[PDB]
Amino acid sequence: KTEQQIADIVNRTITPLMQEQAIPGMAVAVIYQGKPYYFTWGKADIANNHPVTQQTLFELGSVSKTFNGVLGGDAIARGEIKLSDPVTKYWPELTGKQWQGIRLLHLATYTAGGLPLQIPDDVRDKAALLHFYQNWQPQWTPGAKRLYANSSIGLFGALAVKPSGMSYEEAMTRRVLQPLKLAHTWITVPQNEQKDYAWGYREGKPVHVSPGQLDAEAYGVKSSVIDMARWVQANMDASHVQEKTLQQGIALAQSRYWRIGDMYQGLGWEMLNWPLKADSIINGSDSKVALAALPAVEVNPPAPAVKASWVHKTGSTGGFGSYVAFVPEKNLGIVMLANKSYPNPVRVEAAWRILEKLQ
Amino acid sequence: QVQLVESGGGMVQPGGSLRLSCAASGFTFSNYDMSWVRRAPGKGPEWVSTINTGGGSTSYADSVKGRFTISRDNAKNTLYLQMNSLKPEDTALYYCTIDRGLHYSDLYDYWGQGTQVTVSSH
Incomplete structure (x- = not known):
């Protein structure tokens, strides 16, 4: 509930994390009662010996999707798109009869019917991309x-x-x-x-x-x-x-x-x-669970945003691990950015510890 | 932490049998459908079999339908794959995992260490 108690919590949690996970550098933000608090540790560049700063840019990985979604949200609010619109209405060259009945909603929420995790690295232009979606079953x-x-x-x-x-x-x-x-x-x-x-x-x-x-x-x-x-x-x-x-x-x-x-x-x-x-x-x-294929139950109409929620996203790239979480009701939140990928369970457990102490 | 620990692999002569075990920990094993996947030498991954939560549903790939039998023991949190009448075509590394369906290309820190099965004369 103070500027120093928050620091003590975050350090007690992050120091052993970086130590046992071999994380060169971390930057962590804690929104407590609406105010943001920032913390830095380690190096962003070992060779050039550059410290991690509050300006240091980290690769977010999958967290970028939260920017995707919201932008989609924005485009919905502008009247440009409807989640109920068929995918083919915006890319009419996708003529496959299997794409009949797939809507933007299904793309947005990974419910199209098993679309593959990654675009094959050999799919380098948008022509190969069109062929790739055409021949997906x-x-x-x-x-x-x-x-x-x-x-x-x-x-x-x-x-x-x-x-x-x-x-x-x-x-x-x-x-x-x-x-x-x-x-x-x-x-x-x-x-x-x-x-x-x-x-x-x-x-x-x-x-x-x-x-x-x-x-x-x-x-x-x-x-x-x-x-x-x-x-x-x-x-x-x-x-x-x-x-x-x-x-x-x-x-x-x-x-x-x-x-x-x-x-x-x-x-x-x-x-x-x-x-x-x-x-x-x-x-x-x-990653064994978050990547699994799980049955989904539709919510129609979509339930408005629930303030009493834990809203989060994890995202990792070859050399970065990042996690974002927040509870609107509590006005509480945490950002964790590290220039080294480490198992998402450890990441979430640390974030959970920190935010549970601060509620 | 979510660890799947394969075992039961070994060297055998064609026609023999071999029971693979997969011991799970770190998650509610009984809540998820489990799959056996295999990777051949030089070749890419390939789905082998899947078994639903309650274990009442089983599903196999054409290459092994009739010869294999997937099962599970949610009390001891353990997946099993009985392999009968093996062929040299089944020589590969075997993993268990939570079911993703059929495709398992382009995979991250994910696969366990599996266990190798080898079927040949010499």
Whole structure:
């Protein structure tokens, strides 16, 4: 409940984490009673000996999807798209009779029917991408099962912006980042910010995300710990956004579209009821579970955002591990960015500890 | 933490038998459908079998239908795969995991260490 007690909690938790996990650098933000608190440890660049700072850019990985979803939300609020619109209405070259009956909703929530996790790295232009989606054969009926995938929500992000007349990067920059004043959040890191761009570390070597089709939509975002705290404050309490389309899209990103056990699938965001049991999110965060194919029960109409929720997303790249969580009712939140990927269960357990102490 | 620990692999002559075990820990094993997947030398992954939560549903790939029998013991949190009338075509590394369906390409920190099955003369 003080500036120093928060520090003590966060340190007691993070110091052993970095120690036993071999994390060169971490940056962590804690929103407590609406105010943000920031913490840094370690190096962003070992060779050049650069310390981690509140300006250091980390690769977010899958967390980028939360920016995808909200943008989609925004595009919904603008009247440009409806989640009930068929996928083929925005990419009419997808003529396969298996795509008949797949709507933007299903792409957004990984319920298309088993769309593959990753776009094959050999799919390097949008022609190969069209062929790839054309020859995909569904495992299930739309709406029957949830299979977490980059291809699905990536295509959702790519198609949601089509009516905008802008590219995904451009539309995001204009309709999300700039209105919310995230001047340290990038799909493409400009060369003059490259000293703040931490290096990820995979078995000792320094790495950055490799470009891929739809990388911006699924896993290509990089940001500082302050920009991420602002992102969490905006999604946690969006009443202070002047842009009503964005206000609304943020609300829709946390709408509850499907029920998977005790988890509710938003647009990118993933929600559980607060209070909750750690084991749920901890065990579920494991890549063996979070990537599984799980039966989904439709929620129609989608339940509006629930304030008594634990809203979160994990995301990792070759050399980075990142986790975001917040409880709107409690006005509480945590951002964790590390230039080294470590098991999502450990990440979530640490975040849970910290936030449980601070409630 | 969610660990799956394969075992039962070994070297055998064609026609023999071999029961693979997969001991799970760190999660509610009885809540999830479990799959056996295999990876051949040089070749990519390949789905072998799947078994639903209650164990009342089983599903096999054409290559092994009729010869294998997947099962589970949710009391002792253990998946099993009985393999009968093996062929040299079944020589590969075997993993258990939570069911994703059929496709298992482009996989991250994920696979356990599996256990190898080898079927040949010499």
